[PDB]
Amino acid sequence: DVSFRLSGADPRSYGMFIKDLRNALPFREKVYNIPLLLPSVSGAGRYLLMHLFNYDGKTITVAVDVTNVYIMGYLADTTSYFFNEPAAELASQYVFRDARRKITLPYSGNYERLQIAAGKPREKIPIGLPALDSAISTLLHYDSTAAAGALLVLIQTTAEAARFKYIEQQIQERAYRDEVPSLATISLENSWSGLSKQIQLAQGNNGIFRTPIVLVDNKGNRVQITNVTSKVVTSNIQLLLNTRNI
């Protein structure tokens, strides 16, 4: 289990939590020195528990699938809450057995469905470490409209920051003040599968991508990643989704 406490959190304890989250996910190989996540794990071993504490010290436990860093559900007090999708139901068999009741949230956990349920696209929700504290407080009391907005903050400040060093840095700049994500952060989030696939297929193709990944950058718009010497590959992406899961 990894843990993060927002009381007394600053940019470096947060980097320390994201470091431990990354280091808790099992891998067999490194492709171009990036951890390649396993095709499948079976049993309860497939799930990582993160214990998150807000400013006041209340907590929620979040369950993450270690093969893809996908947030499946969470436990708040005695109630477990799971996304309405097949993998989250499978997950409810291994985690939070101890809950007095299990509620299925009325949406799956992908971004389109959560934005629709929240009433705001990601681009309009301030993220940062104050927003994470808020999100933990919202998840402690069931409301599905407000839980969709809090889960969008929760995915990006934990799972997306683990996947990309650039997003982790974005959240460390937002440690005492929230701010909506840059288009670059949204671009990166959406490209993890694509980028993971091409870095994998680039082995045996001299580090060259079969098809270029296009991202918008930290100045404005439209950028094509064609090979593994790009800084996106050498410095930014931190975990790769196994091609068997794409």
Ligand SMILES: Nc1ncnc2c([C@@H]3O[C@H](COP(=O)(O)O)[C@@H](O)[C@H]3O)n[nH]c12
């Ligand atoms: N519940 C969740 N927990 C973690 N990551 C995600 C995602 C991420 O959203 C990204 C973009 O998804 P789509 O390609 O389905 O739009 C993917 O990298 C996926 O892993 N959506 N929902 C998530």
